[PDB]
Amino acid sequence: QLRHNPLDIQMLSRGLHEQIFGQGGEMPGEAAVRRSVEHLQKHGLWGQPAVPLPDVELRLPPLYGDNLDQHFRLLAQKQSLPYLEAANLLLQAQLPPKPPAWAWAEGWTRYGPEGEAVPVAIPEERALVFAVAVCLAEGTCPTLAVAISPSAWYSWCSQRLVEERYSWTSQLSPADLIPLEVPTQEQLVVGHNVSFDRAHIREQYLIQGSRMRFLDTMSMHMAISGLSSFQRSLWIAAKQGISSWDWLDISSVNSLAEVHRLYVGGPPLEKEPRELFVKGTMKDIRENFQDLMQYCAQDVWATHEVFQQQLPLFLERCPHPVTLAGMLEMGVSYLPVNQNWERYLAEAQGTYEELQREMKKSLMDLANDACQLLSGERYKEDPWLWDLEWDLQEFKQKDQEDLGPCSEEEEFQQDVMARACLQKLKGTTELLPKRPQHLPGHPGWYRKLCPRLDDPAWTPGPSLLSLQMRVTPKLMALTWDGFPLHYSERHGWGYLVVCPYRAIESLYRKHCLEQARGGPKDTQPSYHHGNGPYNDVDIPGCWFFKLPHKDGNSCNVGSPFAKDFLPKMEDGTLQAGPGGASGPRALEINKMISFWRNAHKRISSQMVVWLPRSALPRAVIRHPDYDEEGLYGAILPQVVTAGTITRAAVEPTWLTASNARPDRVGSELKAMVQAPPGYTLVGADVDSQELWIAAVLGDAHFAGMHGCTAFGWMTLQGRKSRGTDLHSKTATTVGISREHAKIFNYGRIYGAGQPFAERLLMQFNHRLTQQEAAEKAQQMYAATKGLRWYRLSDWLVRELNLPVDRTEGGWISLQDLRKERAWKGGTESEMFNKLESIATSDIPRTPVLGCCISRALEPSAVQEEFMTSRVNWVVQSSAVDYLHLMLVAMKWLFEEFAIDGRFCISIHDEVRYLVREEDRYRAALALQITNLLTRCMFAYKLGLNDLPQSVAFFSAVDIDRCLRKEVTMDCKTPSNPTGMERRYGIPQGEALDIYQIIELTKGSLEKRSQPG
Amino acid sequence: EGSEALLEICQRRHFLSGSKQQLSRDSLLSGCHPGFGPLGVELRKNLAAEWWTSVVVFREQVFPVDALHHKPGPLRENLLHGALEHYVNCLDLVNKRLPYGLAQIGVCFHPVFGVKSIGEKTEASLVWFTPPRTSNQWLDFWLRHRLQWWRKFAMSPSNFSSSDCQDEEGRKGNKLYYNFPWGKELIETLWNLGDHELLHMYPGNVSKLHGRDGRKNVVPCVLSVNGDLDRGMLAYLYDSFQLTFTRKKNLHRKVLKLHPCLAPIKVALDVGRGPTLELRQVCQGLFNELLENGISVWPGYLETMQSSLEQLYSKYDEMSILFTVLVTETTLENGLIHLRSRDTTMKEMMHISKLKDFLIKYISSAKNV
Amino acid sequence: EALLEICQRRHFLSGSKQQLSRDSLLSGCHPGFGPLGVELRKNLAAEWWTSVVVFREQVFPVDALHHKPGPKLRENLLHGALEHYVNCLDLVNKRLPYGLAQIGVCFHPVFDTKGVKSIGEKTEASLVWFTPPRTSNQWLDFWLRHRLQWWRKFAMSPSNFSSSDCQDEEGRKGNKLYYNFPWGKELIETLWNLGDHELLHMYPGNVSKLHGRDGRKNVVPCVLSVNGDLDRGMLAYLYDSFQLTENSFLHRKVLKLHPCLAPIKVALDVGRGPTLELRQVCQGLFNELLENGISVWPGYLETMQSSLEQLYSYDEMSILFTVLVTETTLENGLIHLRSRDTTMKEMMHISKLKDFLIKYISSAKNV
DNA sequence: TTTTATAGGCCCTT
DNA sequence: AAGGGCCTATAAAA
DNA sequence: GAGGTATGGCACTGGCCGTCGTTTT
DNA sequence: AAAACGACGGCCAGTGCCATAC
Ligand SMILES: Nc1ccn([C@H]2C[C@H](O)[C@@H](COP(=O)(O)OP(=O)(O)OP(=O)(O)O)O2)c(=O)n1
């Protein structure tokens, strides 16, 4: 049961290859083998030693259909059939007119054809168009909602809206949410950004799986007519007031109004002018109940019409059922949480505050000293603080001996006299200007730094200070290689009302003691070297240089306190004026707190719904880990199923959640998602998903072999112990470090070019002078993606009959008469050519699932305009197809073999499921089977039946109790210093190989067959 | 060094009493110093008040307790023993809900090498009875909170450091240090003492000591947090004087940048030149108003005019007074008074009616920064 | 009396029944005070400090050691103030009339035949007033007046606080203050005109260091020593709060302690209903009151396992007001408020409760 | 306010 | 090491 | 012909409307 | 005593830069 590829690549086991219908496949030819072997010899990647892989034999679950493609088609069709039926019921539905007036009754009310409002428990409907409104001021509890179903309107009101109550529960429960699910037959809910609506229906927070699925008009809109973020800016600017703009009239931003404009058109829909839910209070919502209900019904109606137009387009444009099934599965994602979550939040915030306060204190103290420079007018002699405003204003206008003690009446009269005399001054106070001044007796910059007194959140001193303010580098007197810093308007931060150049020169002389156009008047040269423009800004002493930037000379430095300047701080090029460790400590604090400063408003505001003991299942209740005093609940991430042009998921918080880092304050965020007692999380991340997709596409384009191209060979059988791995070979060919080679390759593969490589080379070794470095980059590119050959693609043979140049292909020749672009020999040239072919085809479609690109990216609309976007879209949408395949296969395996589990989360590469502790090992086996099947499906759709044993199975599945990159991570953070185990009773999980899983599970997914 | 100038300022500004030789580092750290001046006493009072507000006031399970100074009753070394004695009686306060504390601030006496003498340290102790299952967690909690409390009023909070330590009997604990210019000195100790001392204190029926851990009864583990408030006051005094440089040394202004909550004197009040009777009347009224709202004021207007405004500003800065208030002939006309901040040395105009509210808001907000 | 039993039960006084006796309490050898007693004594000391130190521009805090090094224990705070006198004279630029105030524990011998000898502790508040002799006696009367008023300030029966005049062997005037306990009068504060003999004996030679300015002339100050027992004062106020039976019309008993001195101002408790909702609302109100400086007894942490009458019989703890939060409060925000003094029950909105308590305390202070 | 039920806790049963 | 005896305290309640 | 796709925050700047002080018959 | 005008300041959108994820 051992197979080898004709390129001597360890293949799928002969036992398993025949089970993936390998028998009766195509036989690879001989000339293709000769060409591939010659290519590998030319790239020096042929004949390398191979380490055999232990072949895996196991009875696979039944495979339906003739081939794997029919298998996946059947599975996805079965999974999505009822929801397609419900969507068709919505599609071919004639709706009654909405009621003339709305109910204003607690709960659900159904409106009859004559407008009569009959209360109902839940809408007894299989398909609904849904829109939920929440009072943002009151928190996260839904306030009112409207639903459309075939021949029925429904409106739901909250008890917190109908009933006036002094207090409601701060901690939400499913009883507070709205009911939709029918008890024990499967429902479909359609909405615009339907995840937000889903987060407000109670039954979706139960641990058990729910047969209700969701369809998002945003996701389908991105699938059919979407645009990139740059394309979004272009579209918005064009509609507000690149050579071809034909794509404007076929795509729009994801807002419901413009989606209705594109797909439905006709009369525009008007938004709420006051935004009462977003801004107003609950009283405002009550006072405008009918209008707000009408607006919600308008949103429901617009979404319904949009869905009616979209569904035929989406089904036509993504014809494979796997895409729809994967979108439905991604619609419902579950994040289990416990009380620890809350503590986490508090702890994180507390830590953040402390780390902030310290920093602020430092900065504030500096300001409190800088004012002294106004006393001696020495601010104009300061090499940093002479740029600031130091203005001040005025207020507005039009011995005896011991007398002894005193009488009781005497001191009484003295006290009352003092009080009465003091009252006169208050009486005078009420005669001076109504508008008070803000620090008239302080400098202008210090007045800017201080909060105004009438601010509700006021703190003493210049509390507004932060490391990101322009004044802060001046206050710390930051010095770059002996140079005071400065702020040029057009070019950010660099290193150098009359400028004190004598003081700057004295400071530089002192620094040297501690250890280029040449105008001596005004702007000056430096006999020193560096990047940036020099003489655009005029200074009397002007050896001006821009700070180095990781994004080239064209870019500018917005803050010296950025995380990438900590290495320069440790080097000593960048230094602090006060000295010691004030600078390094400030940069360390900034590094620690940047993630939380960005993400606290999202993480804290995340919506938790806590299940009561009654909602808790009996398995959870009867478990030793069940703490009755504790709280168990869920967060439903608000994922847009297809939020990018690549149809990838978009979630503001959880798809960008940082992994645990020892310095990042809130980095234990994903670890805080902890399974309930009796349940564990079984997850896995795909091994080099994008790299392998690109490699297999290149291999299929070049020949019928796996690893026939050099890039595919490297991706399949790289090894860091010796050479022959991709990064090490790139480093050996170029001449720089292996980490630099890795960053070069990963930057390039996303559709990069010459400037990126030249900039990275210059940043890495300034010692290599610009043009030399450029040549180096060029050579790198000639090795990776060979030189372009135009091949008569500008007529061209007629112009060639001059005769001038030779050969049947071009040499990027330029004619300058003013009367199929391929690549050449290179390891990645074949995959680049395949990607360009897919991008430039008339209707670019994903090679596996056949999903089309957006109508705003089709060549007929964007001819030769967005090329990097399309070539990157090919790989990224292929990854999305891979994700959909995995989801469909996992759903099929769970529903087939009765694995008590649920889809938890998917972060691009990672997929994690919430399984029972009993069936965690069966779930791991199912995950391995699904990975094998998805890789084989990719291979078959490309054209190759066999699959390398290297990528056949997952590297290792993670069985844990929380989301971590590795089960061994203890998630030490500033906010979680004690560690995961010592803070909360969460032990380390385990990583299981395919061999370990099969040994544990006897190679079966059946509960009876599982050993005990 | 700048330590000599700081001690000279403290001696001159009545932060520390006694002669220069009596205020040696050994004398100060041992607790055998002659005593504190009024400013030092007030600073220590503010520090103890902040400790009480951060431990006792905002916790339902922490109660005040008074322990006697003499052990036999037929001297005191630590406040732990009195709280351990009061544990059973005070258990009734929480209906035996086990996690609860007894807090006390008082003077303890320590022998040191006549040939041997006795030093006094006013220390603040919290004895926290906790269920054993959560003892280490509570220890970590208190460690974090105490360290944060020490760093809260510090100009250079990094000087306050925490270390982990082990008992010879295997009991975990944490120590807190302040980095004086000569090195680190111990200022607070947190120990997980178990229940051995508590059990030895009540021989016979152990059921008398049982406390409720939720639905379970267990003999509590005793957590002892003991901080030296004298050494803390000394540390904050050293922290107010920046020993660091460059332009900071060019300024070279002798100021004690004490935290507003800890500064012994908040405001300084003085008169200018003009009609003395009216100015004295208005200053007496303002002084009474400010005192009535609990804001400490230094009555500089009672002294005649012998020093300049610069001399007054330097004297007040050495006394760590937050604000200086000047009443002139202008105040009699339009009611505006001159307010000078210690931090920025900048002068501002403020009307008298707004002064009390502004000062109270400043003091209250200083905690919330 | 039954008052001692109540103090034992309500954690005003610590120790057993036999350890708490009239002789033991007066001698100062009692085991110690309960948390409520400690808070009452702290409030009393704060009231003393606000009426003596911040009251006068010339009064400064002082720290005196407890052991008086040299091979004994402290008996009075006078010695420490006299030691700090010369150093603090520079604080006032030798402006002679000025004071040093201090509150601290002093030790005195105590023993009984039943023998050996024991040590008792008394927490005393001392004011040492250096005044020119020409007005010294006048100042003495002043302080006497003030001290008497202060004792009468918080007293339900100020007539029990009495003042007596006494004379030294060498003709120095002084005053004593007494409280009328049920068994008789007991001394609680002492004021003496000590001349300058202790001060001169403290500095043999260099008498020029002790000179203080008084109308451009230099004179050695006269020392006035005011010494009050805060322990016995707290005991006196406890006895004064136990004015026979309770209010309204079982003969239960209430301690009508002064609002400024009462250790606990308000008590918070829940009624019948959703425990989580009521506890959340009570926690919010508790945090609000603490942030506004109102001492609160957190009874909601025990729910309401006891009856309403036993819960009110807080009266033995001298709590000014009792607040009950029910499921009705979740609807309209109204809570039940019971006053200790009048025993009247009222409905009040939570929003007004903190303001009402603060205004009540402020008016009690200004009366 | 029990009383019977509910988890504690401690002495005895393969 | 288990589960099954003993009293036994708890908290909302028929 | 471009390192790609998303998310989001903070600091800084400019345009517009309300208020207040100042100036005219 | 009514009418024109300039200055100061707050609110919101746009822009640049930085920080996360895959
Ligand atoms: N629990 C995990 C964590 C990670 N990975 C894999 C997915 C990533 O693709 C891989 C990291 O690959 P590098 O880019 O770091 O490459 P290697 O270090 O694996 O390759 P080389 O041997 O060439 O250095 O880790 C995994 O399978 N399971």
Numbering used by the authors:
A (entry chain A): 68 to 251, 262 to 318, 342 to 498, 526 to 623, 645 to 663, 721 to 999, 1003 to 1027, 1046 to 1238
B (entry chain B): 64 to 137, 181 to 219, 227 to 357, 361 to 485
C (entry chain C): 67 to 137, 180 to 222, 227 to 361, 367 to 430, 432 to 485
Give me lines lifted from the publication on this model:
Accurate replication of mitochondrial DNA (mtDNA) relies on the high-fidelity DNA polymerase gamma (Pol γ) to faithfully copy the parental DNA to the daughter strands.
Arg853 is not a catalytic residue, yet its substitution for Gln is completely void of polymerase activity. The complex was crystallized, and diffraction data were collected to 3.4-Å resolution. Although crystals of the Pol γ R853A ternary complex were formed in the presence of the correct incoming nucleotide, dCTP, the binding mode of dCTP differs from that of the WT ternary complex. In the WT Pol γ ternary complex, dCTP is bound in the N-site by displacing Tyr955 and forming base-pairing interaction with the templating base dGn; Arg853 forms an H bond between its Nη+ and the ribose O4′ of the dCTP. However, the Fingers subdomain of R853A is slightly less open than the binary complex, with the Fingers subdomain rotated 1.56° toward the active site. The measured dissociation constants (Kd) were 55 nM for WT and 37 μM for R853A, which correspond to ΔG = −10.329 for WT and −6.298 kcal/mol for R853A, indicating that the lack of Arg853 resulted in ~4 kcal/mol binding energy reduction and a 670-fold lower binding affinity.
